[PDB]
Design an enzyme around this catalytic site. Sequence first.
Site, short mmCIF file in Angstrom:
data_model
loop_
_atom_site.label_atom_id
_atom_site.label_comp_id
_atom_site.label_asym_id
_atom_site.label_seq_id
_atom_site.Cartn_x
_atom_site.Cartn_y
_atom_site.Cartn_z
NE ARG A 59 -7.12 -1.87 4.05
CZ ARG A 59 -6.14 -0.80 5.81
NH1 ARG A 59 -5.33 0.02 4.61
NH2 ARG A 59 -6.37 -1.12 6.82
CD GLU A 91 -2.92 1.21 2.07
OE1 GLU A 91 -3.98 0.82 1.85
OE2 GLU A 91 -2.87 1.02 3.16
C1 2XM Z 1 -2.80 6.94 8.84
C2 2XM Z 1 -3.52 5.91 8.04
C3 2XM Z 1 -4.14 6.97 6.90
C4 2XM Z 1 -5.50 8.12 8.34
S1 2XM Z 1 -5.02 8.63 8.67
C5 2XM Z 1 -6.40 8.89 9.08
C6 2XM Z 1 -7.13 10.09 9.84
C7 2XM Z 1 -6.39 10.94 10.94
C8 2XM Z 1 -7.37 11.69 11.84
C9 2XM Z 1 -8.42 12.05 11.79
O1 2XM Z 1 -8.57 12.89 12.95
C10 2XM Z 1 -8.29 13.47 13.57
C11 2XM Z 1 -8.90 13.86 14.70
O2 2XM Z 1 -10.29 13.39 14.27
C12 2XM Z 1 -9.03 10.72 11.32
O3 2XM Z 1 -10.37 11.23 11.86
C13 2XM Z 1 -10.73 11.08 10.00
C14 2XM Z 1 -12.65 11.26 11.41
O4 2XM Z 1 -13.58 10.22 11.45
C15 2XM Z 1 -9.24 9.63 10.03
N1 2XM Z 1 -7.23 8.24 8.67
C16 2XM Z 1 -6.29 7.27 7.58
C17 2XM Z 1 -7.29 6.03 7.34
S2 2XM Z 1 -8.01 6.94 5.66
C18 2XM Z 1 -7.53 6.23 4.33
N2 2XM Z 1 -7.82 5.65 3.63
C19 2XM Z 1 -7.08 4.77 1.91
N3 2XM Z 1 -7.49 5.16 1.27
C20 2XM Z 1 -6.56 3.94 2.17
C21 2XM Z 1 -5.88 4.31 3.60
N4 2XM Z 1 -4.91 3.14 4.50
N5 2XM Z 1 -6.53 4.66 4.79
#
Ligand code: 2XM
Lengths: 229, 230
Positions: free
Chosen positions: A97, A34
Amino acid sequence: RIKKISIEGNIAAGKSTFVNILKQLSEDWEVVPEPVARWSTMEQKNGGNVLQMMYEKPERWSFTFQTYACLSRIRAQLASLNGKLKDAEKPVLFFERSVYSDRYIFASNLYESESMNETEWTIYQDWHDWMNNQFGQSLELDGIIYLQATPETCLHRIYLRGRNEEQGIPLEYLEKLHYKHESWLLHRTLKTNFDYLQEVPILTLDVNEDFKDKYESLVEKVKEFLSTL
Amino acid sequence: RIKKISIEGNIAAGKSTFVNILKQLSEDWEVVPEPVARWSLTMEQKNGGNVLQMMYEKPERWSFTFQTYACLSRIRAQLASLNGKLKDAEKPVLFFERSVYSDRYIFASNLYESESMNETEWTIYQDWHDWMNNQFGQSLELDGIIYLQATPETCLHRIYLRGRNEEQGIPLEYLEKLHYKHESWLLHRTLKTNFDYLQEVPILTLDVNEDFKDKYESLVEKVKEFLSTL
Ligand SMILES: CCCc1sc(-c2ccc(OCCO)c(OCCO)c2)nc1CSc1nc(N)cc(N)n1
Ligand SMILES: CCCc1sc(-c2ccc(OCCO)c(OCCO)c2)nc1CSc1nc(N)cc(N)n1
Ligand SMILES: O=c1ccn([C@@H]2O[C@H](COP(=O)(O)OP(=O)(O)O)[C@@H](O)[C@H]2O)c(=O)[nH]1
Ligand SMILES: O=c1ccn([C@@H]2O[C@H](COP(=O)(O)OP(=O)(O)O)[C@@H](O)[C@H]2O)c(=O)[nH]1
């Protein structure tokens, strides 16, 4: 003729561990890792910032991040079909993924938690659909391996892994991701806008017990499963 | 065998008008109107009308998202035209209202230079642009470009003439900078461009400062001499 298999699972469920163990068993097996995992070159450079920007304000960067994650994934997956496993008898490329998890697990969830407005969601879907109906059957999956696990296992596995920027990820987010995984992959109650995914086999494997030294049984299932397709 | 000519120029220079003049003059000539102009029914319209309005309100927030969906819709819509019509024409010409090069080297770049996209939004867009044209946008390659040249002053009036409520708030200062990037791309040929065939494409420059709506015949003759050099 190269079979395409996606490995799915919550943050820190052990997917990269798994697929790295798999890469080592068959000269005939390869891995597409990924890119966000790689972020976690220009792309490597862009991904860093946009991942750090995503953490510090997701309602601002969710669209940008989801479009870049997907494009970075689509070009690593296309590249390996052209690049890896060239003369193999029984070629299998395992994807860390998929374009489907990109959209129907992660981007769907971000919409549901209001980090993308409607306009953002149907722009993303529109873009994801036009394009993922441009590659005929070339990325379409031969099957899916669902790495099923609990959020506390997953939460435990974030600490152990020790990416400091991830040490804030709370249980409840991890808990949201799981239902979405379980809803799509386990109880199979989430129709996409992709035709063939109805007739797409699914292997679920319990990775709550530790497996770095006890994987034969899991792998036996993957080879069993691979021979049905 | 379709010939692809890009019609280029500033906001309300007269592109949409000239394009609707040209099209009627032969069954071998058709046009692809630019998505953004239809956005000011289909879900693309809804998204389009929506994000354009957001872009008016808050460009520092919305320009990447705007730029991305306007280019995508363009590529899409140009494909639908090129693989649709002109099967039967003996001398087929497709006139596009602007190009993917416009999107990038006028509008996106100006948004980046005006700090309405940031270094990462703009670098991500450029990467996205490099790749989107090369996976899907390859037979959209252009044979020529026609620049309709109109002073920043001309447009504001014409903007007032066309009378869209959103447009009236656009400042002469904006027409000035987009006015300035067109010249360097298509006159001086200052612009460095990733698409190397683009530095070699014939351009035609046409002053369109007078109402040409009643009186377009000499413009149409310059187009015609260009098309047979191609
Ligand atoms: C480090 C993995 C990437 C991240 S970072 C992240 C995220 C970080 C902080 C966040 O909140 C800050 C305080 O509320 C967060 O919250 C989103 C609110 O629901 C998500 N979600 C993600 C998962 S989204 C994602 N989309 C993809 N298409 C692939 C993948 N691996 N991840
Ligand atoms: C029909 C014009 C669409 C708009 S709207 C717009 C714009 C609107 C309000 C703006 O600011 C007022 C609020 O501070 C604005 O300022 C941009 C700041 O760099 C631009 N620029 C544009 C030009 S960007 C563009 N990109 C394209 N790819 C195509 C296209 N036709 N236009
Ligand atoms: O059987 C296992 C599987 C995973 N992990 C740890 O869990 C963390 C997350 O695993 P991975 O990076 O593979 O997670 P994913 O790729 O699913 O995010 C890593 O530090 C692994 O060493 C472990 O200790 N035993
Ligand atoms: O010679 C001209 C050129 C343009 N227009 C008007 O100026 C406005 C802007 O023209 P157009 O929409 O063609 O500009 P574009 O935005 O397509 O460049 C429209 O109301 C046209 O009717 C005009 O009256 N005479």
